[PDB]
Scaffold this active site. Sequence first.
Site, short mmCIF file in Angstrom:
data_model
loop_
_atom_site.label_atom_id
_atom_site.label_comp_id
_atom_site.label_asym_id
_atom_site.label_seq_id
_atom_site.Cartn_x
_atom_site.Cartn_y
_atom_site.Cartn_z
N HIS F 202 0.80 -1.18 0.08
CA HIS F 202 -0.09 0.04 -0.20
C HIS F 202 0.94 1.16 0.11
N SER F 206 0.83 -0.83 -6.78
CA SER F 206 0.98 -1.76 -7.51
C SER F 206 1.98 -1.24 -8.88
N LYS F 228 -13.39 -7.73 -12.59
CA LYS F 228 -12.39 -8.72 -13.41
C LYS F 228 -11.78 -9.60 -12.56
N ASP F 229 -11.58 -9.67 -11.06
CA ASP F 229 -11.44 -10.72 -10.48
C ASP F 229 -12.31 -11.80 -10.21
N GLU F 272 5.32 -34.83 -2.61
CA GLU F 272 4.54 -34.50 -3.44
C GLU F 272 5.20 -33.71 -4.56
C1 HEM Z 1 -2.66 -23.14 3.86
C2 HEM Z 1 -3.41 -23.99 4.61
C3 HEM Z 1 -3.26 -25.34 4.52
C4 HEM Z 1 -2.65 -26.20 3.69
C5 HEM Z 1 -1.64 -25.85 2.35
C6 HEM Z 1 -2.99 -27.68 3.83
C7 HEM Z 1 -2.33 -28.67 3.47
C8 HEM Z 1 -2.71 -30.10 3.43
C9 HEM Z 1 -2.18 -31.16 2.96
C10 HEM Z 1 -1.43 -31.07 1.56
C11 HEM Z 1 -2.67 -32.23 3.33
C12 HEM Z 1 -2.53 -33.74 2.80
C13 HEM Z 1 -3.92 -34.31 2.43
C14 HEM Z 1 -3.75 -35.37 1.52
O1 HEM Z 1 -2.80 -35.84 0.68
O2 HEM Z 1 -4.81 -36.36 1.29
C15 HEM Z 1 -3.40 -31.93 4.45
C16 HEM Z 1 -4.08 -32.54 5.43
C17 HEM Z 1 -4.90 -32.55 6.65
N1 HEM Z 1 -5.20 -31.16 6.69
FE1 HEM Z 1 -4.33 -29.19 5.92
N2 HEM Z 1 -3.61 -27.60 5.10
C18 HEM Z 1 -4.17 -26.47 5.53
C19 HEM Z 1 -4.61 -26.07 6.49
C20 HEM Z 1 -5.36 -27.08 7.35
C21 HEM Z 1 -5.99 -26.52 8.70
C22 HEM Z 1 -6.07 -25.20 9.19
C23 HEM Z 1 -6.36 -27.73 9.23
C24 HEM Z 1 -7.17 -27.70 10.62
C25 HEM Z 1 -7.67 -26.83 11.33
C26 HEM Z 1 -5.96 -28.75 8.45
C27 HEM Z 1 -6.25 -30.16 8.77
C28 HEM Z 1 -5.72 -31.31 7.94
C29 HEM Z 1 -6.19 -32.52 8.45
C30 HEM Z 1 -7.20 -32.98 9.54
C31 HEM Z 1 -5.63 -33.24 7.58
C32 HEM Z 1 -5.94 -34.87 7.39
C33 HEM Z 1 -5.82 -35.62 6.07
C34 HEM Z 1 -6.89 -35.38 5.14
O3 HEM Z 1 -8.05 -34.99 5.70
O4 HEM Z 1 -6.62 -35.48 3.97
N3 HEM Z 1 -5.41 -28.40 7.37
N4 HEM Z 1 -3.50 -30.65 4.80
C1 HEM Z 2 -0.97 -16.52 0.36
C2 HEM Z 2 0.17 -16.27 -0.28
C3 HEM Z 2 0.16 -14.58 -1.11
C4 HEM Z 2 -0.82 -13.83 -1.02
C5 HEM Z 2 -2.31 -14.01 -0.39
C6 HEM Z 2 -0.45 -12.55 -1.88
C7 HEM Z 2 -1.18 -11.50 -2.14
C8 HEM Z 2 -0.82 -10.55 -3.13
C9 HEM Z 2 -1.89 -9.53 -3.58
C10 HEM Z 2 -3.39 -9.48 -3.22
C11 HEM Z 2 -1.13 -8.98 -4.35
C12 HEM Z 2 -1.47 -7.59 -5.43
C13 HEM Z 2 -2.46 -8.03 -6.39
C14 HEM Z 2 -1.74 -8.58 -7.40
O1 HEM Z 2 -0.45 -8.16 -7.59
O2 HEM Z 2 -1.94 -9.79 -8.24
C15 HEM Z 2 0.25 -9.37 -4.29
C16 HEM Z 2 1.32 -8.40 -4.95
C17 HEM Z 2 2.54 -9.15 -4.96
N1 HEM Z 2 3.14 -10.32 -4.39
FE1 HEM Z 2 1.83 -11.55 -3.29
N2 HEM Z 2 0.76 -12.72 -2.30
C18 HEM Z 2 1.29 -14.20 -1.63
C19 HEM Z 2 2.60 -14.59 -2.13
C20 HEM Z 2 3.67 -13.91 -2.67
C21 HEM Z 2 4.93 -14.67 -2.83
C22 HEM Z 2 4.95 -16.03 -2.47
C23 HEM Z 2 5.62 -13.48 -3.50
C24 HEM Z 2 6.93 -13.42 -3.98
C25 HEM Z 2 8.09 -14.38 -3.64
C26 HEM Z 2 4.95 -12.54 -3.54
C27 HEM Z 2 5.29 -11.30 -4.12
C28 HEM Z 2 4.41 -10.14 -4.54
C29 HEM Z 2 4.68 -9.00 -5.22
C30 HEM Z 2 6.30 -8.72 -5.79
C31 HEM Z 2 3.63 -8.41 -5.41
C32 HEM Z 2 3.75 -6.92 -6.16
C33 HEM Z 2 3.98 -7.25 -7.85
C34 HEM Z 2 3.34 -6.18 -8.45
O3 HEM Z 2 2.28 -5.23 -8.17
O4 HEM Z 2 3.86 -5.70 -9.54
N3 HEM Z 2 3.53 -12.59 -3.00
N4 HEM Z 2 0.33 -10.12 -3.57
C1 LIG Z 3 -10.27 -8.21 -4.57
O1 LIG Z 3 -9.79 -7.73 -3.29
C2 LIG Z 3 -9.15 -8.70 -2.29
C3 LIG Z 3 -9.92 -9.15 -1.68
O2 LIG Z 3 -11.30 -8.91 -1.41
C4 LIG Z 3 -9.62 -10.22 -0.80
C5 LIG Z 3 -10.45 -10.76 0.56
C6 LIG Z 3 -8.04 -10.26 -0.49
C7 LIG Z 3 -7.43 -11.42 0.24
C8 LIG Z 3 -6.71 -11.03 1.59
C9 LIG Z 3 -6.30 -11.25 2.60
C10 LIG Z 3 -5.81 -10.67 3.81
C11 LIG Z 3 -7.07 -12.61 2.93
C12 LIG Z 3 -8.08 -12.70 3.97
C13 LIG Z 3 -8.12 -14.09 4.83
C14 LIG Z 3 -7.35 -14.34 5.77
C15 LIG Z 3 -6.39 -13.65 6.44
C16 LIG Z 3 -7.71 -15.51 6.45
C17 LIG Z 3 -8.91 -16.11 6.35
C18 LIG Z 3 -9.54 -16.68 7.79
C19 LIG Z 3 -10.60 -17.61 7.91
C20 LIG Z 3 -11.21 -18.30 6.67
C21 LIG Z 3 -10.95 -17.93 9.29
C22 LIG Z 3 -12.57 -18.16 9.41
C23 LIG Z 3 -12.88 -19.66 10.01
C24 LIG Z 3 -14.37 -19.91 10.31
C25 LIG Z 3 -15.37 -19.01 10.46
C26 LIG Z 3 -14.18 -21.27 10.95
C27 LIG Z 3 -15.43 -22.02 10.56
C28 LIG Z 3 -16.09 -23.03 11.45
C29 LIG Z 3 -17.27 -22.89 11.80
C30 LIG Z 3 -18.28 -21.59 11.58
C31 LIG Z 3 -17.79 -23.77 13.16
C32 LIG Z 3 -19.36 -24.05 13.10
C33 LIG Z 3 -19.82 -23.34 14.41
C34 LIG Z 3 -20.56 -24.10 15.49
C35 LIG Z 3 -21.20 -23.01 16.53
C36 LIG Z 3 -20.63 -25.35 15.57
C37 LIG Z 3 -7.17 -9.96 -1.68
O3 LIG Z 3 -5.87 -10.05 -1.71
C38 LIG Z 3 -7.78 -8.92 -2.63
O4 LIG Z 3 -7.16 -8.32 -3.44
C39 LIG Z 3 -6.49 -6.93 -2.97
#
Ligand code: HEM
Ligand code: HEM
Ligand SMILES: COc1c(O)c(C)c(C/C=C(/C)CC/C=C(\C)CC/C=C(\C)CC/C=C(\C)CC/C=C(\C)CCC=C(C)C)c(O)c1OC
Lengths: 93, 93, 126, 61, 57, 385, 55, 62, 247, 49
Positions: F202, F206, F228-229, F272
């Site tokens: 910010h 960009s 567009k998104d 993987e």
């Molecule tokens: C960026 C977020 C996450 C990534 C990239 C990720 C990645 C993965 C991957 C690659 C597996 C292997 C599944 C397979 O090969 O079948 C896995 C399994 C699993 N993950 Fe995640 N995970 C994320 C977030 C979470 C969170 C927040 C939870 C729980 C709160 C969770 C719960 C589990 C569980 C219970 C499994 C059991 C294996 C299955 O259900 O397939 N994960 N996760």
């Molecule tokens: C969960 C992971 C990430 C999220 C949610 C995220 C999110 C974003 C968003 C929303 C933007 C602005 C929109 C866009 O440029 O498309 C952005 C820009 C950017 N991100 Fe990420 N990003 C992630 C990971 C990364 C990684 C892994 C890198 C580099 C190693 C990176 C580098 C950049 C750069 C350099 C920009 C600015 C590029 C430009 O505006 O020309 N980000 N990121």
């Molecule tokens: C187009 O504009 C956007 C934009 O709109 C967004 C969102 C993003 C994304 C930006 C972020 C910072 C990502 C936001 C998200 C996170 C930081 C993490 C998200 C967190 C969660 C999903 C946690 C929420 C989890 C729950 C509610 C748990 C669910 C479980 C429940 C409800 C249990 C059931 C309840 C009972 C009582 C049984 C952009 O990058 C972006 O481009 C600029």
Amino acid sequence: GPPSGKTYMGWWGHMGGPKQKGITSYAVSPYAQKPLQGIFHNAVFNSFRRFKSQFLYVLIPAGIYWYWWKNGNEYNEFLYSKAGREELERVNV
Amino acid sequence: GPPSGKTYMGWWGHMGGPKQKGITSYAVSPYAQKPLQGIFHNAVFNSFRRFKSQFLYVLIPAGIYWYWWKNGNEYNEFLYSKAGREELERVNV
Amino acid sequence: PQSFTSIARIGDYILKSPVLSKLCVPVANQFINLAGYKKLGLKFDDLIAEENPIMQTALRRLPEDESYARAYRIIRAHQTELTHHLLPRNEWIKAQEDVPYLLPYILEAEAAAKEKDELDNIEVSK
Amino acid sequence: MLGICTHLGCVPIGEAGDFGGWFCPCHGSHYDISGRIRKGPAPLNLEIPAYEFDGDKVIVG
Amino acid sequence: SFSSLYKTFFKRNAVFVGTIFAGAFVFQTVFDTAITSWYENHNKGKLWKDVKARIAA
Amino acid sequence: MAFRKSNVYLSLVNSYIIDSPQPSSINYWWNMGSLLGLCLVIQIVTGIFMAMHYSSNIELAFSSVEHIMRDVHNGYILRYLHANGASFFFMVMFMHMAKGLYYGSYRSPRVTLWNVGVIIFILTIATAFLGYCCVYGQMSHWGATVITNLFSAIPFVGNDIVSWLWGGFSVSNPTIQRFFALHYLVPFIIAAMVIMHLMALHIHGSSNPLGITGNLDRIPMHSYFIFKDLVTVFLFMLILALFVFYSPNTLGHPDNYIPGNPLVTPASIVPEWYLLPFYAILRSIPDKLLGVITMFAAILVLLVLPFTDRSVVRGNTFKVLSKFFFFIFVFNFVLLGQIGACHVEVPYVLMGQIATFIYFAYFLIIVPVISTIENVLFYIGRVNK
Amino acid sequence: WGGFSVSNPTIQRFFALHYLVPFIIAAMVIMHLMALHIHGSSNPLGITGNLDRIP
Amino acid sequence: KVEVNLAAIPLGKNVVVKWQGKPVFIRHRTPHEIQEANSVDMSALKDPQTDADRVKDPQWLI
Amino acid sequence: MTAAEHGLHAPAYAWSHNGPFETFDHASIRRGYQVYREVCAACHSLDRVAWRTLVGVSHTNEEVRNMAEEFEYDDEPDEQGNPKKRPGKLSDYIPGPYPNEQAARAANQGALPPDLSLIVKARHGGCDYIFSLLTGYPDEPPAGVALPPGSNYNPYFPGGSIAMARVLFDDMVEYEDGTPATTSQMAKDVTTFLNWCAEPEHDERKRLGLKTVIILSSLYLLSIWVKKFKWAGIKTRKFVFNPPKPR
Amino acid sequence: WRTLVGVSHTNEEVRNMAEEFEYDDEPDEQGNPKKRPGKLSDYIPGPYP
Ligand code: HEM
Ligand code: HEM
Ligand SMILES: COc1c(O)c(C)c(C/C=C(/C)CC/C=C(\C)CC/C=C(\C)CC/C=C(\C)CC/C=C(\C)CCC=C(C)C)c(O)c1OC
Ligand code: HEC
Ligand code: FES
């Protein structure tokens, strides 16, 4: 970024109070002072001054609720003994 | 809140570019236009122009790394065959 | 990050050698034609990154009429790229118009900055 | 000694092949009572674990 | 008329939003029924119901 | 002023997704950032609902995943969404990082934004590794054995770190319950580091495909890039739904349906697919200590980029040689993954050693040398001296 | 409940929620501090504190 | 639902089993005690409840 | 490695459940269970499959009741604490032939027959590998190979030697529906049944994927029109430059 | 058993106490159940099954 709404606090240099004029302040460095100065005198005389002005606002409510609790607790002990089994029938059912 | 440092972007009204003078812009409402104008024409002629300008920067590196991969796969298959037993002992040992 | 003083030092040596000027320049003209910025209505001096302190003074000192024209060429290229098209062939920048208009303002600002650094590290021969 | 092939890990078949040793069927190498591999790409010999003696008995650990 | 069509459904957002919700309720039930019917017909003779009645002859 | 600008909470929404001034020239490659935000939400929600039916004991871990598929209503949808969603997470992230490498988004004004992204990349690799181990199949148990055994090459303290990580003498019950607890926590650290990612973006905004300033022509974010998104959001779920309902096991390994057994080696052991390029770099060095160090170097060399680029123009749009050698690096990366899924054979050993050299020589040799040559060609091609 | 009474489905899902809500609490504390930073804190005298401040 | 048969319970002893997370009783009935339940108080003590719906199997009260 | 230790690649057959709109042939599932019970169940287990999951797929509710009631399951101890046994019910799981792994290896020359609840998903080749392995036993091992005693030859097994012998022979099972039971017919039927054991959601997953793709494809097309409508003013925009006079 | 060593008894004394009870062992090569005397890693057994 865009500016936000008007608040009631500013920052250093524009805190937002009234304009000040005619007030002077003095202070001495702590390295040339004596910390702990007067603690023994304050620990007895200042504490008695503060306690005397507030203890009635706290103790009167505390003593009212404590008398209610003990009186209601003693009555329960009377109903569930042999002496007060007759009253336990009428009051309950 | 305190002020921040010096950046290279502002907000609306003080974006931070050069002063603009002499440029005029015109636009028409989207409600009075045809959104899908020229899609068929662009899908063929514009698409051919874009492809013809960039396809040499992608295909040549791809073809170099694909010829390398296939040549290495055939050599390995020949090495572990009956006709490659004289070479497998003289390389891997 | 490579300074224009160093770029010009290498370039001017090449352009004064009869042998070196004979093979490098023909491949440099084809390199510029393939770059394709002239087909959007731009000169090379409009592509230089401007977020450094050196290039901020050069753009400040640029004459007013040249500064107005540069703003139009930059806005025109953004609109052309937005449509994924090119400019009509009659609106392309020609070779005689692709001149280094901002180059003298960069070399002078860079020379002043180099002299400042040499004077903060001065050592009197005592 | 550890029942793992000294190259990439395997399982020894009980008293089958070679000089009355054991068998590493992952590639086709066998064993001997001394624990000395006689053929294969094995870099070194079989590793022995640490242990102590209950006088005449043998433990693992 | 096109003026009456705009005045009834597109002038007030409440009617516009309510129409979308009432059109999603009807689409939901009709879309499911038409999908199972095509899916079952494409696999005639392979379902348990088909083979159960055949062995019941 | 408007309530959207005066409110304490709405003003953060307005300043980031409504009134944000965006350049008018950014193409669809600038849409991967919003997709990564949707991927992170998908993984968190499906993981939490799956965690209500999961047991981390080493004797019940494999059977609890089979319980989710069979007994839980719509449980196979959650599992295939979570497993395939993680594969699509790395697809977008790889393209997100290559966009900024092509357009010079790492250069001077935005070095801090680039550095935070490298930290997010490291954490995401760790999160995916920890969740793969929680299934406890044949490839997750033996994959965890090789990975955690590489820390034993550290001098002096190496052997003690492995015992502390294992919780015992090998990959056992203490390890599996350890990894599920960390797999729950690390995604929340990523979500907090994503907010720091947006804060550093910010300050200067960009960039644009042309590589020049965008302060002369801006349009608001709302109603122009919100819609567009939405175009790539719908396309993203269409391809994901294809892999979830019609081919859910194409991106996996069949050996992970065999329950984990510490007594039978599962022939070839590979991670993987998205970790395969980094697995081949580790195996190319015939030394455990040196080979392990080189594996984290491959992620840390990305920080050297803002200083080995000697070009006065930002991006590769108008650069001939830089465009050619950019795709050499890209397809070099793909070949590295292929070697990582291969055996240790006669040609493949040398193929991965040369391709490892090209990976490092690109940042440290090719980019500095090429960028200086193009600077002169731009100069002598128009100056009349 | 996940069933007909408090049983195995209930206990396993209550632990998953006990892990999550603390991270929601940490997010509302930041919103708590953001609303405090507008006008600052108050004082025991109940009057303005803009005339005498210390960091 | 539970599936327990009634061909393995003798006459004159209580059997308490758990279903749906809560316990239930079952026991064979006696000749006149159930007739006493017909002669037991109708509505003069606690509850105006007839024996018509309480028992549907006159030999098992659950 | 050599092609012998790799194992011969299985060809591709035209299964009736192949295809985005195709389901399982439930007559082959019903026939495949009979092959398992009469041939496979002597040495392999299906412990991840419950009796209740067969109702409405290949058998009636009453049929499965009579099938499970032929096995004995442990019950709760009696009033004195002695152990008891009871006949099976719909909520149980299909029992295996051996009490533990040592018993299994003792009856199979030290080799362990794997469980067959996920075997289709756990092998590279799926249904084509199971069918090719069950029908790929040559009467003679190729000239040169030396089989260890107690092992058989099969080109589809990695390495060549497999501890399981040929078990399928023509006219060894009498189907109730009159289908001629041959080696190929029985190998085809038991493979369909095992595939249903690994993926019991196959039929309902493909029906849900049809609705998802149809709805999601419409939204992708609708969003393209909406984006182009909102961008119409910016896409068609004109600029003119008239240089200002010096002042 | 191991928690009594160094608290109220000697290592050599606790071993004798544990060896007077029987615990289930791994099945033999034919798969039959087996028994074995107790060790320090076992738990104190109760009177009722
Ligand atoms: C960026 C977020 C996450 C990534 C990239 C990720 C990645 C993965 C991957 C690659 C597996 C292997 C599944 C397979 O090969 O079948 C896995 C399994 C699993 N993950 Fe995640 N995970 C994320 C977030 C979470 C969170 C927040 C939870 C729980 C709160 C969770 C719960 C589990 C569980 C219970 C499994 C059991 C294996 C299955 O259900 O397939 N994960 N996760
Ligand atoms: C969960 C992971 C990430 C999220 C949610 C995220 C999110 C974003 C968003 C929303 C933007 C602005 C929109 C866009 O440029 O498309 C952005 C820009 C950017 N991100 Fe990420 N990003 C992630 C990971 C990364 C990684 C892994 C890198 C580099 C190693 C990176 C580098 C950049 C750069 C350099 C920009 C600015 C590029 C430009 O505006 O020309 N980000 N990121
Ligand atoms: C187009 O504009 C956007 C934009 O709109 C967004 C969102 C993003 C994304 C930006 C972020 C910072 C990502 C936001 C998200 C996170 C930081 C993490 C998200 C967190 C969660 C999903 C946690 C929420 C989890 C729950 C509610 C748990 C669910 C479980 C429940 C409800 C249990 C059931 C309840 C009972 C009582 C049984 C952009 O990058 C972006 O481009 C600029
Ligand atoms: C009746 C049909 C039948 C089917 C279908 C079947 N079995 Fe096996 N099976 C084994 C043994 C032992 C192995 C392990 C082979 C090995 O590890 O070398 C095995 C392995 C397998 C495998 C694994 C193949 C692989 O690639 O690992 C499958 C699948 C299989 N059997 C299915 C003993 C048997 C026996 C006892 C003679 C019978 C009967 C038997 N198997 C009957 C059947
Ligand atoms: S693993 Fe046994 S010889 Fe290599």
